[PDB]
Amino acid sequence: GSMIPYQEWHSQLQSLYDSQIFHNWALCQDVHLNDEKDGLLLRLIPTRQLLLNHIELYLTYSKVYNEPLLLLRIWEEKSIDGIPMTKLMLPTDIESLLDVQGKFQLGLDTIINLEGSVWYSFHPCDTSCIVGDQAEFMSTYLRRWVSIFIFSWLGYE
């Protein structure tokens, strides 16, 4: 693990949102900042290999672990009896959709339930990669975290 304090997360999250980085990301359909500005929902544009899908990322702060928490869910279209239908993708399939690159998902399967909605805790790696010995680089934590936890499996380009 790592630690970034909440005040630092809050600030960097607003700064990131303001930067327009997600707004000008061509992948990204729309961006939303929660009321507390604690959290950010990204909706990716329709993707087939990355029968179309729609990917949702909820960027949040875990107050228990003091680290960002990336919540994942995916809408899949599926032909049922010849009829196109939409369902929420099941985790084991999310595990296939992805590893095809980044074959490793860390730790234990973890479903986060948000007011009735089911999300996947996304953990390709240990967030401790992001910090150095002395925490010198704290100011860019979130930005670099984005590169590792998001851009790495969904290319900016």
Rounded to whole angstroms, how far apart are CA atoms 91 and 110? 9
Kindly state the smallest distance separating residue 59's Cβ from a second copy, in Å.
13
Kindly state the smallest distance separating residue 65's Cβ from a second copy, in Å.
4
Kindly state the smallest distance separating residue 60's Cβ from a second copy, in Å.
8
The partner in contact with residue 113, picked from Hg ion, a second copy, none with C-beta cut-offs of 5 to 8 angstroms by kind, is a second copy
The partner in contact with residue 107, picked from a second copy, Hg ion, none with C-beta cut-offs of 5 to 8 angstroms by kind, is a second copy
- Asked if residue 30 lies in contact with residue 157, where contact means CB atoms within 8 angstroms, the answer is no
Question: Which element (helix H / strand E) includes 16?
Answer: helix 6-19
Q: Which is nearer to Hg ion, 34 or 140 (CB)?
A: 140
21, 41, 50, 125: the catalytic one is: 125
Rounded to whole angstroms, how far apart are CA atoms 72 and 84? 23
Rounded to whole angstroms, how far apart are CA atoms 93 and 101? 14
Rounded to whole angstroms, how far apart are CA atoms 39 and 64? 15
- Asked if residue 67 lies in contact with residue 4, where contact means CB atoms within 8 angstroms, the answer is yes
Q: Which is nearer to Hg ion, 14 or 66 (CB)?
A: 66
Radius of gyration of the chain (CA): 16
129 is catalytic: no
Q: Which is nearer to Hg ion, 80 or 129 (CB)?
A: 129
Q: Which of 80, 90, 129, 135 binds Hg ion (CB under 5 A)?
A: 129
Kindly state the smallest distance separating residue 141's Cβ from Hg ion, in Å.
12
Rounded to whole angstroms, how far apart are CA atoms 17 and 99? 28
Q: Considering the rule CB under 5 A, would residue 131 count as an interface residue with Hg ion?
A: no
Q: Which residues are at the interface with a second copy (CB under 8 A)?
A: 1, 3, 60, 62-67, 69, 91, 106-114, 121, 123, 125-128
